[PDB]
Each structure stands twice: as C-alpha cells, then as structure tokens.
Amino acid sequence: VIRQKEKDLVLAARLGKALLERNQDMSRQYEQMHKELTDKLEH
Amino acid sequence: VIRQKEKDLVLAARLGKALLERNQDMSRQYEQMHKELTDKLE
Amino acid sequence: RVSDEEKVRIAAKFITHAPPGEFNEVFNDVRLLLNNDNLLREGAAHAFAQYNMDQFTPVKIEGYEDQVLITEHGDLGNSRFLDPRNKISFKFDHLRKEASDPQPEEVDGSLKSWRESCDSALRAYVKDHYSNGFCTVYAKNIDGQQTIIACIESHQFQPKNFWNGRWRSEWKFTITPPTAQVVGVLKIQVHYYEDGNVQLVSHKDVQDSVTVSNEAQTAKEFIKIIEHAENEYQTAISENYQTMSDTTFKALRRQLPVTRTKIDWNKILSYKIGKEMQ
Amino acid sequence: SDQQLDCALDLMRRLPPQQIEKNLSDLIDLVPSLCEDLLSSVDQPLKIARDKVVGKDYLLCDYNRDGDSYRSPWSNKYDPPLEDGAMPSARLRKLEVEANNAFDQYRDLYFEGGVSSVYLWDLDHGFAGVILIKKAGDGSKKIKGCWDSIHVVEVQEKSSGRTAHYKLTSTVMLWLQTNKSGSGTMNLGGSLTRQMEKDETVSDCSPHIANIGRLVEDMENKIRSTLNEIYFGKTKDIVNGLRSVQTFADKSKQEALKNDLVEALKRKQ
C-alpha cells in the first residue's frame, strides 16, 4: 500500500532515527566519560 | 510511484539502520576504549 | 536523445574491447542494457564476428578432438571458416560458441603441404612451450602470393581467481620463397581484478626473415625464429616487470622522495623550509 | 532499471582503462536519465583547469563543482563566473590555502612535478576535504604515464581535548606505457581504492592537516607498493603461467622430480 507503507516505513525510519539519537546521546556521554577518565589520568 | 517509495524508503529506513549499526560500533569501541583508559589508569 | 543506428557503433565498441574470458559478461551487461536484441542482433553480430575472428577464438571440432582456432584469414561468408586440419568446412555460432556443419571442405589446394608441415612443427612447438596452447595454420594463395598464416593461442579463464589472460600469437609465414620475411604479431591481453582492476596489453611487432630453403628445414626453422622471438619476448616482458619499481613508477611517482626520508609535516606546516631564500 | 544500473557498473568495471572518459560518455548516451547517477561511482581521470588571476592549476571534481563552476583554491573564485557559489568557511579558507601549500610540498617531494588541489567543506563536528593529484608522465620521455589520485578525507573531530577521528578513502588510477625494444609496446592500465581510519591526537605541533598528510602519505605508499608487487607481479605470473620458456618434457623432468619430492615430503608424515 502506498499510503500505509508511507506511514509505517517513514515511522520505522523515524523510530530508527530516534534510536540513532539514543545511541548518539549514549556516544555523547561516552566521550564525556572518556574525557573524565583522561582527566583522572592527567591527575 | 509505488515501487519508488517502496525501494527508496525500505532501504532508506535500513540506511538509517546502517547508521544504527554505525552508532552501535561507536558505543562498542567507546566502551572498549574505556576499558583501556582504565587500564592505563591502573 | 540518441538514434538507433548509433547503438550499433556503441555495442560494437563494447564488444571489440571485451577482455578474454569475459565476453559473455559483456554480453549480459549489454543485453540487459541496450534493450533491443534486433539492433544488437545485426550490429553486435558483426561485432561478434570481428571479436571472434581476430582474437583467434578457440572453436571445438567434435569430430576429431582438435579444438581449432578461428582466424580472420579463412572464411566463406556465413561463419564458413575453412578448417585446415582435417579439411572440413564448418559453420559456427559466435554466441553459442559451438561450431556447426562439419562438411568435408573441398579446399582448392593452396599450401596444404606447408599447412600441415609448419602446422606439425608448430604442434611440437606448442606442446613444448605452451601449456594450453592451440595451433592453426592457414594456407592461402593471397593476391598471387603463397603464404602460411600460422597462429598460436593460449589462454586461462579462471573467474574464481578473478583473472584471465590470452596469449595470442600470429606469424605470417610469407612464403615468398627467396626471402620469407616472416613478419607477424604476438599480442597479449591480461586482465586481473581481485579487489581492484589491472590490465596488461602488449604486442611485439616481430620482424624476421629467412630464405625458404626447404619445407621441413623452414618448418623447424620457422620454429627456430618462433622459439627465438617468443622466449625473447616473454623473458623481456618479465624483466620489464622486474625494472618497474625504480624506472616506470619513478617516472610517475617515486617510492620515497629524493631525500630518502618521510615528511616532517610538523616542519613544513610550522615554518617555511627556507624556500623563500635562494 | 536498477538491474540495468548494476550491469552498467560491472561494464565499467570490465571496461578498458584507456578510454574511460569516452566510453563513460557513451554509456551515459545510452540511458541519459541515469547519467548523473553514474558520475558518482565511476572512476575517470581528472580535468585540469586554469586559474587566470594567479597563474596556477587546479583540478576538477564534484567537490569543487560549485553549482556548475569550480572553486579555484589558488583564488577562491568560481569559473564559470558564478558569483552565487558556496564559499567555504573563511576559517576553512585559511586552512585550505595551507592545505594546498602542504600538498604542493607533498606532490613536489614524491611526484617531482604534476598538479595538485585540496578542497574543503564542513561537518557538524569537524570538516571534510578532497585531495586531487594528477601526474602525467614526462612528455619528453617515452614513458607515457598518468598518475591520478583522489583522496576523500573526512575529519570527524571529537568533542574537545583535540583528538579526532580521521576517516579517509583514496583512489589511484594508474596509466603506463613503454615503447621498449624488448617489449615493443607494453601498455598497462589499472586502478585501486582503499579506506583507512585513525584517531591521531591533535595538538599545536600536530594539527589536523599534518595528520591528514601522514595518512595520505602512508596510503599512497601502500597503494603504490601493493600495486607494484601484488597486482603487477600477479600479471607477470599470469604471463609466465600461460606460456613457459622452458621446453616441455624438461619441465616433465623437473616436475617429475618435483612430484617425487612431493611424495618424499608427504612420505615421512
């Protein structure tokens, strides 16, 4: 179906992008954890 | 019209899923690097 | 928009440059692309005739187990190349790659003695230096001149190993009895594409002569000139590959700079080396 | 017509690397609706432009193809005269002029001549550039060669602390010929492509451009090396495997004793 797959395929893409940003925030905090570990290394 | 949307959007949502694989490898390698950072700290 | 008659020249251009052992793949990528099998049927059929008459195509003869070669120098129109060995005429489907009609060719008689004589000597030569070689000798009274067009072909079509290669060799044994200026060509095309793409294309315009003294003497002597030029050519090619890291590539790109060290990027970016001063 | 595109790419894959431009134009002349779909993954040589105001040279690709003009890094101008192009960052313009400078040094050290160009563009957390290098053979010499190099680099700079993630994709489109008496004419085409990524620490002594310079240097050394030994030796092996120089029945003797020693080695197992 043109319309129904528009709704669900773009929704799967939207949810996939949301999960992308989930892993992005994870990676954001991951590099934050990385710099913290290096700060301790510096000390 | 139909198959254009079907091909482009199934594989486009799966291209975003390719970015999901990318981000998953990012998180994996990040935690491995955290282990190594702690190793150096040790 | 492009017309239909230009598509014939296009398909001809794509078939006449197809690497050995990869003709069928060019055919698939041109059949699923040109979309009109009638246009490429006629145009590409002539292109198939060219591509299979010039590259000494290995054609199988089911009657005598010889696997003769189709050389440009012998034909009677509808793929009716005259097989010199066994004196049989034959039709051949350029696409099916299967011959047809092994009619016993009533050859007019040109240089049949020379044909099987120099053919025999070349069979010995092929069985000496060619692993999967194939010999074929065309005898013809071309334009009032008796000549032997001995041809040599060897190939390896290994698609699982991502490579090909087809040693092709022609020797116009010009039977100009007082001075057989045996001038021929040994064209080579080698393709390799494992994780990349590399193509070797070469040929040596061999030029040599000898008086047609006798038949057996010039048969094995023809082999003497052949073994000379071929051992010479293969060896020389190998040494051209040997002297390539330092000469040809150094014409293009050196392995290391003339200072024989790496680049201190920190130095170049940090300050100008003194290039402003001379 | 997607299968048609797959077979088209395979046709370019098996196409002779001597007439890449002409045959690419021909393939586009078949289905022109698929034209600028192919000019993204079909490798062809470069185009030399001419900066009129500076008196230099600059190569042409899609990254400098601003609209339908080309941003001459020696002048930061567009040719055709498009005064509406996408100028790079002024920050990146300074980084780009020093990039062009460093790669002119690079090019002069390895290529001893030739034309080069380095363009740049952004990224949210970094930037990205391309490095064009085109070395034609010595026109005076008989070696008609044409080295062609394209280096897609993407600097994925991290948060702070000056540590980055340098993603690089390269391509070399070789070309060679010798009219030597021992070989007649020995044409030699060829093309490569690789990828590499490293996370070298950025510093005041180690800027991004220096990291990129080390990566481009190592990459081209690997490609030139890899080519010369693996691929070209493979072609030499193919010519030697086709026809052997030694007479057969002599090779039967050596292969006979070879199989004898094969039995000897696999005899004391």
Curated annotation (Swiss-Prot), chain A:
State where the protein is found. Cytoplasm, Cytoskeleton; Cytoplasm, Cytoskeleton, Microtubule organizing center, Centrosome
Q: In which tissues is it expressed?
A: Highly expressed during early embryonic development. Predominantly expressed in kidney, undifferentiated neural tissue and developing eye.
Which stretch carries the motif CC1 box? 12-16
Q: What does this protein do?
A: Acts as an adapter protein linking the dynein motor complex to various cargos and converts dynein from a non-processive to a highly processive motor in the presence of dynactin. Facilitates the interaction between dynein and dynactin and activates dynein processivity (the ability to move along a microtubule for a long distance without falling off the track). Predominantly recruits 2 dyneins, which increases both the force and speed of the microtubule motor. Component of secretory vesicle machinery in developing neurons that acts as a regulator of neurite outgrowth.
Assembly: Part of a tripartite complex with dynein and dynactin, acts an adapter linking the dynein motor complex and dynactin. Interacts with KIF1C. Interacts with RAB6A and RAB6B; interaction is specific to Rab6.
Query: Which family does the record assign?
Result: Belongs to the BICDR family.
Please identify the protein, giving its name as recorded. Answer: BICD family-like cargo adapter 1
Organism field: Mus musculus (Mouse)
Lineage, opening ranks? Eukaryota, Metazoa, Chordata, Craniata, Vertebrata
| First-to-last residue of the parent protein present | 105 to 147 of 577
UniProtKB/Swiss-Prot annotation, chain C:
Q: Which GO terms describe its molecular function?
A: actin filament binding
Q: Where in the cell is it found?
A: Cytoplasm, Cytoskeleton
| Keywords assigned by UniProt, alphabetized | Acetylation, Actin capping, Actin-binding, Cytoplasm, Cytoskeleton, Phosphoprotein
| A GO term from the CC aspect | cortical cytoskeleton
Where does the record place the modification N6-acetyllysine? Answer: K13, K91
- Which InterPro entries does the UniProt record give? CapZ_alpha, CapZ_alpha/beta, CapZ_alpha/beta_2, CapZ_alpha_1, F-actin_cap_asu_CS
Residues annotated with Phosphoserine modification: S3
Q: Name one GO biological process term.
A: barbed-end actin filament capping
Entry's SUPFAM superfamilies?
Answer: Subunits of heterodimeric actin filament capping protein Capz (SSF90096)
Its assembly, as annotated, is:
Component of the F-actin capping complex, composed of a heterodimer of an alpha and a beta subunit. Subunit of dynactin, a multiprotein complex part of a tripartite complex with dynein and a adapter, such as BICDL1, BICD2 or HOOK3. The dynactin complex is built around ACTR1A/ACTB filament and consists of an actin-related filament composed of a shoulder domain, a pointed end and a barbed end. Its length is defined by its flexible shoulder domain. The soulder is composed of 2 DCTN1 subunits, 4 DCTN2 and 2 DCTN3.
Q: Which family does it belong to?
A: Belongs to the F-actin-capping protein alpha subunit family.
The task this protein performs is described as: F-actin-capping proteins bind in a Ca(2+)-independent manner to the fast growing ends of actin filaments (barbed end) thereby blocking the exchange of subunits at these ends. Unlike other capping proteins (such as gelsolin and severin), these proteins do not sever actin filaments. May play a role in the formation of epithelial cell junctions. Forms, with CAPZB, the barbed end of the fast growing ends of actin filaments in the dynactin complex and stabilizes dynactin structure.
Q: Return the protein name.
A: F-actin-capping protein subunit alpha-1
* Originating species: Sus scrofa
Gene from which the chain derives: CAPZA1
UniProtKB/Swiss-Prot annotation, chain D:
Primary subcellular site in the record, as a coarse category: cytoplasm
Q: Which subcellular locations apply to this protein?
A: Cytoplasm, Cytoskeleton; Cytoplasm, Myofibril, Sarcomere
Q: Please name the SUPFAM superfamilies in this protein's record.
A: Subunits of heterodimeric actin filament capping protein Capz (SSF90096)
One GO biological-process annotation of the entry reads: barbed-end actin filament capping
Q: Name one GO molecular function term.
A: actin binding
- How is this protein annotated for GO cellular component? F-actin capping protein complex; sarcomere; WASH complex
Q: Which residues carry this modification: N6-acetyllysine?
A: K234
| Keyword entries, A-Z | Acetylation, Actin capping, Actin-binding, Cytoplasm, Cytoskeleton, Phosphoprotein
Q: Name one Pfam family in it.
A: F_actin_cap_B
Q: Does the keyword rRNA processing belong to this entry?
A: no
- Which superkingdom? Eukaryota
Keyword Transcription regulation (UniProt): no
Subunit and interaction comment = Component of the F-actin capping complex, composed of a heterodimer of an alpha and a beta subunit. Subunit of dynactin, a multiprotein complex part of a tripartite complex with dynein and a adapter, such as BICDL1, BICD2 or HOOK3. The dynactin complex is built around ACTR1A/ACTB filament and consists of an actin-related filament composed of a shoulder domain, a pointed end and a barbed end. Its length is defined by its flexible shoulder domain. The soulder is composed of 2 DCTN1 subunits, 4 DCTN2 and 2 DCTN3.
* Described purpose of this protein according to its UniProt entry: F-actin-capping proteins bind in a Ca(2+)-independent manner to the fast growing ends of actin filaments (barbed end) thereby blocking the exchange of subunits at these ends. Unlike other capping proteins (such as gelsolin and severin), these proteins do not sever actin filaments. Plays a role in the regulation of cell morphology and cytoskeletal organization. Forms, with CAPZB, the barbed end of the fast growing ends of actin filaments in the dynactin complex and stabilizes dynactin structure.
Q: What is the similarity comment for this entry?
A: Belongs to the F-actin-capping protein beta subunit family.
Q: What is this protein called?
A: F-actin-capping protein subunit beta
Name the source organism: Sus scrofa (Pig)
